[PDB]
Amino acid sequence: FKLIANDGKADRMIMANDLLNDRIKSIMCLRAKQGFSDPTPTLVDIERTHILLINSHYKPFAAMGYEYQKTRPNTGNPTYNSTIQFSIPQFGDFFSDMVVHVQLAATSASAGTVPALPAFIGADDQVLTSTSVVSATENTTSGVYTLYTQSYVNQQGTTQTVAAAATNFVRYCEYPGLRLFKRVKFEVNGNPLDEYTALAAIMYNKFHVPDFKLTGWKRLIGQEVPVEAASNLVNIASTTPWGSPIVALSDVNGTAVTGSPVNAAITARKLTQVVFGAQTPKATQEQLNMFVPLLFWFRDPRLAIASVSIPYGQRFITVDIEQQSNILFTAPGNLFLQTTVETLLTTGAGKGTATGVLLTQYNRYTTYTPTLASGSSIDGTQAVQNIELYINNIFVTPEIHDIYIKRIGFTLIRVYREQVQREVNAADQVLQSQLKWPVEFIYLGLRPANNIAAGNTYQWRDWHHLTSVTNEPVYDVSQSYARVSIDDTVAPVGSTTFKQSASQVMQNQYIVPVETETLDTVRVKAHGIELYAQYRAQFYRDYIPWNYGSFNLVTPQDKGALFLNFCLYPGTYQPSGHVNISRAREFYIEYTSSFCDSSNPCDLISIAKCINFLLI
Amino acid sequence: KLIANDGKADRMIMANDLLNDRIKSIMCLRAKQGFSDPTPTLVDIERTHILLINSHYKPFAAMGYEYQKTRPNTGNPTYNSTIQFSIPQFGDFFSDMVVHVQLAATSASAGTVPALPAFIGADDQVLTSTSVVSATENTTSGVYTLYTQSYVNQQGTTQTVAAAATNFVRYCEYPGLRLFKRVKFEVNGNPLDEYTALAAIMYNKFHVPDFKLTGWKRLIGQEVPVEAASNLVNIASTTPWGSPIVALSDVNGTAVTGSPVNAAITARKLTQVVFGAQTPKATQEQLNMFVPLLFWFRDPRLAIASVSIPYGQRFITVDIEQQSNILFTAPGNLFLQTTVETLLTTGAGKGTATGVLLTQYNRYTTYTPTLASGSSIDGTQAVQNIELYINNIFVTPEIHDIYIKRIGFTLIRVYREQVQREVNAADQVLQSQLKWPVEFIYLGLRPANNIAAGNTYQWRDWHHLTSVTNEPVYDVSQSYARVSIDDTVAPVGSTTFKQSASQVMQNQYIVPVETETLDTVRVKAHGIELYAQYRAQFYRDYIPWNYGSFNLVTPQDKGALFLNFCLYPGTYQPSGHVNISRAREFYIEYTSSFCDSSNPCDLISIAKCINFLLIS
Amino acid sequence: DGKADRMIMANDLLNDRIKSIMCLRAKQGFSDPTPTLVDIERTHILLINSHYKPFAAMGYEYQKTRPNTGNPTYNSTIQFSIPQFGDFFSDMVVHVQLAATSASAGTVPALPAFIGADDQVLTSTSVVSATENTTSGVYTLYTQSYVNQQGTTQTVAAAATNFVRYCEYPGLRLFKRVKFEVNGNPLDEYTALAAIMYNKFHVPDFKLTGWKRLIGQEVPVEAASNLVNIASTTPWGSPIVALSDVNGTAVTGSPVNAAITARKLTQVVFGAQTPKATQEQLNMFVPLLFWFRDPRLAIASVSIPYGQRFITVDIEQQSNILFTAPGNLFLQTTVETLLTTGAGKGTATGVLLTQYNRYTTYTPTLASGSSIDGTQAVQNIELYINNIFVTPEIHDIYIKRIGFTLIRVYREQVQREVNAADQVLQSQLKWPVEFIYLGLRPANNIAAGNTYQWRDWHHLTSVTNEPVYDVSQSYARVSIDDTVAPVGSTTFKQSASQVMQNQYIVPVETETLDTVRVKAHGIELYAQYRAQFYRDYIPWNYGSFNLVTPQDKGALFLNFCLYPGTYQPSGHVNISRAREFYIEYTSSFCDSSNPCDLISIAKCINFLLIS
Prior knowledge:
It is classed as viral protein. With 616 residues, the first copy, chain A, is mainly beta.
């Protein structure tokens, strides 16, 4: 390797080594004539034109240290569905990031009973006991007798009696720490200095938690994390699980048989993902521990709030707590409805009925459905065992503190501004009347009202989704076959003494959450002037979060989360664009919907982050 | 209790005795110089010390942006054509660009069920319109082996040969990346910069971190996984296993290895499903893509002055791939059922179809998705819309005229690609495309078969830089059944106690196994070693891990290599390059364990070079 | 305008600055009165700005080096020279090559003991026992045997060979000790404990796959299945699809046609951690995690000359890197139940069989006398060094004017613990502390007797194994008399089977730390907080893309700076307090029966002279 510092026009413009060497010759000549003993230039002299890519320089920081502090509420024993207020103690010169520790008690569902059995299916041979319900459909024309059986069993398959004991399981909604804080408010002198609701908390969940922070984020707000599990070897090189008669076959023409398995080429095991946390239904949800961060601007250390700048008399963190019925839900436990259909094909007298003779073919089909126990609901006495505000307090030297107060003047801050408009229109133009400061960007969504409805059995999951979610089942079915000869003196091949039997049993069932988007197009208009033309919602959900923000902006998973951007660097502190209001009086967000109508009302959610100023 | 001045260590990191001296001095000068306030200025402190609590920012020269979409000058768009957009006159600058492509919903044409496979066995051959049956006698063992093959749909209903059948349709992986064969930024008739799908897949591998991946996939039409949860598989203190095998102990009291016990946790499984453009469907929905144009001027800092590239001579030209490389036929609801049955008789005629005393029966059943004959893609599928979206930046007139008169020039990065087809196991390939300083080079040796029409996995392998083979993984359902056919003799130890067993394919996965095509790579330029002969994992794993930070993603593709020559690939500030003298005689040397005359490969080399752009 | 826009953009100030400068330039006689971009940038920032500054000429090239200590082996000290090449040397990575290796031939072990007390038979292929029950008429038969994957029964004492696997992250455990020697004295050094703290905290997802490939961790491969859902059809037979009861209501548990067309994805692994008959040659590029990996902090070769600079790697034993695992050998456990109703019911001679049931599991089993190859060679080991070159003019200025460089060093202490709560003095802290990795790893995680040591060795919690079963369920009915109506008859036989289709092992983590408290020279730096504060909140809040929230439930981060991972210092623990530094813990797991290691790895600030 030889370094080449000056090769033509390209190197002259990128490295400028001829100039750099000329600057050195000039600087050493001036220092020498001016009487310096050391004529070699200073590193600053070089840095006035050229950057040094190898450089160990740094600056000393004004002496600084920090320490967290727990604080209990002024409002006594904490409960669900209440307002909890913390004082911001006088401790550090500044206070910065905050996080609230919430402790929810271990809880179980009340005792219930096995519900009544389903109604009859077939019109014939109806029998109802305490343990099963049996009906049948005859068909003497085809000779097929269909028998319907439904019963209740546990996981091991033991039949459960109607009205016997049964207990539902309990689960927390997804992201319960985000839904638990109905409203979070930082107020000084009676008025809210900044505030946000659970809609902002879930907007943050979708746009500002990259994967290198996700596992801890999920743990802070009570969302279970998946755990990877490894299986036995499913492929072993040079062998196969298939029996020999079907392996490595060739047809009569020498060609390998389509559908004939061959030996595996690699040795591999399977990975599966399991969850067993707050969102998985359990007989007893263990004590839930969450550390909910407060998503205020001053979480940034550079933006730490000077303690003397706010009186201790009226400075508070005030949190409205969601109700338990929106956080904890019952779910089916160790109780399953077994639905079995059996077909018996007879060919003799009475065929198609229960008295038909000569059974040639038998088939069984069976599914299992998790079932709710009657009268088993959540424990309403579940205690909020502990809640405490953690405040990071920063300390500085007395000299710098006095200089900082007298010379800082003000600080640039960011605040939330929320508006929710109920809609039954497929298309509408919604004046944004809570938007009233320089807006950097707006989170936008059209959440169906059913996502938060107590009648939606999937509210625990759908509440934070911004789309209409339907549930598509995926079945794992075990197929079996069996043939048996009942006459040891007659050849089975081609005889009715060569019986047939088959079975399809449900092995497991998955639920695919299928999102149907609620926004087709979005338009942003201010005083009859387009800020954003009518573009497909996919432009705001996919392209804008992809192009802007760097690691501060995450492309959202939710198909309904949209980002109306007005700045060049959405995550950074340095201002880089806004829409002032200002002539923003008539600020309109116009949408088109293929989902929203009178039968499917939705909430147009628009949350903006605005710039304001705090004078210290 | 802050400390600030504990020893030499605190003296060099915080320098608090120095800072106090500077403050005490500054207060005395200002007092001596007649200032009303002697306390220093934050700038005065920051000339030596850095302030960790600082809300300072600089005002930005007023600017705002707005997107504008335009249609091509070349009329109705089609596959296999050139589409050209003019860049309209709108803002003072134009920046990031994205192209909306809309492909009509499409399905395959009607076909037929193909002919059944040939005979497997030599005996008892029967050909039906609905099944093909053969057999293999074995009088020595008494085993009659019966082979049956037929066609079924998903529900299992038999399909008649030459009856109706329709194939499904699928898109190739990353359709938005392959759709654009070439993308041109044209000025004065000269290509100012251009790239291919090869550069697009290099970007897909190296510059899409996980916090941008979901949105990136949606922009280019790649399906996104959807996580689905199952029923509870583990329930604390119970089991799915029947009691006779649960928690057994041997005669010595030790727990039986292989005897399952109750579960200790309660868990669900998570599986992932896809159902988008790449999943075969009877009808693929209207595919909407917003394909970003990966030019350098996507950076807002590097927006192009509208005056410096005049209107009327600036164009975006896009070459569109043929339809047959984007949309593909895949098997529909038609499956080949492969069944082997073995009959173990012991009486007269054992091993033939006339065997009498049947003792054991086995059935083995696999299913293979099958293409219908004469069912192909719709060649009239229209490109329903294509529009270029351009971000337009507006600035004040005062700063505009100052910047255009003073910036002089701007650095740009341009693609420079070369593809050399190889049948040599090792070769030294002169890189003739290189004319300018090179920051880094994307490298790969892609097998020609990955883009060959004869490859039925071309829809998937086209962007892979290795040789991919397909390894089946079988989910097998095993069943057993035993029945006594004589109620007067005990079953145990009697031939009246018949046996039956079945193995049915429940599902099958395809594992894409990558075989690396590059063993070692060496970089030699102007008779100078810039990279010695190093293993391919050095360029694939080590270099992307060490350099680039969040701007350089470690590639999943095992054949993606990154030859770096700068310290910070991904930043605008230059940080190293290969100079033009060496770039004009530049060699990339490889050794391969795969490439030979039976496996031709293309050595793809795409360098990112530095050039310049004058202003007006 | 107005007020808000005057403070964010100050455009009326900017225009007045422009008007002022253009006039003063005209007053002073400048030919071009239009302002300079610098003059604008003294107050306002230019969001569109293609300006850059030229860098002093500099290039880099890597170099490969073989060790001074002869042929490399396991369980040995390997030392490298740092050759003289560039003016500075920077990032380092070590290529390790481990030979392809297989287990020695062994045998099929002895069959298990009898389960039932009756009808006990032992052959070379199976062990059979039975439990009678004349009261219920159920005769239970137990059969255990060895098979391969295809189900072919294996004979006791016949040939059988174990597979081999590597521990997880073999590149991190192989380098038992990595140290940078300068003039005899270790300038900085770390262990595998520091390497796995980097694994948990400093590898974000955009670097994860290559990291795993660098240190020998297998990477999952996504695999797609056939279609499982097809719109407007179903896999279920007609008799159970879309049923309605007698009231017209759709039947609960009756499947309907699929609404979407979807296929499944699953992940498979088949690398160094997956057991194989032959583990092919393993190639790792293990990076050395020293501070001077940052190009800016590259070490001047003149200040640390050749001959007095070395990289020394202590290599772990093979028994901690390579392990045996079950091969193509499985124990089949089968239970059959025969309910008879006639004479001799509940015994082997009972007549009238109405119900048959079979339960069958398979457990992967080790072959006897099949162990790892102790002669497996370290086929190659080489040090890669990035060498940085500069012009002679700037090197001269830089060596005379830089003075010193701040460096960071690892300081580690391991404390064997049997107390449920303790106050542990951190006696290894010489220098200012930026942050501390904390962990309480059970001694059983690195125990030779722990069959899961290949996996648990780097975990900081107590790990237990929870099976998850895939079970195939079957049913069969047969009429054995063609003259009797089957419904309601004992001639209508019943049969059912549960067969294990697969089995997963879920690693269940039990945290070993409940609360942590930090006391230093009589000062509380951290009150007694829950472990989840240090594992979840602190890594989430701090560090940006340089601090990853750890997956390990036992990884704790004791932070004392504002920007961990960045070169510019942003907070530390003064040395006075560091000399009397205590970490007080509370544990639900550690006791006299469960020893644990309190692992504390501090990152400290140190200076380094130049020239």
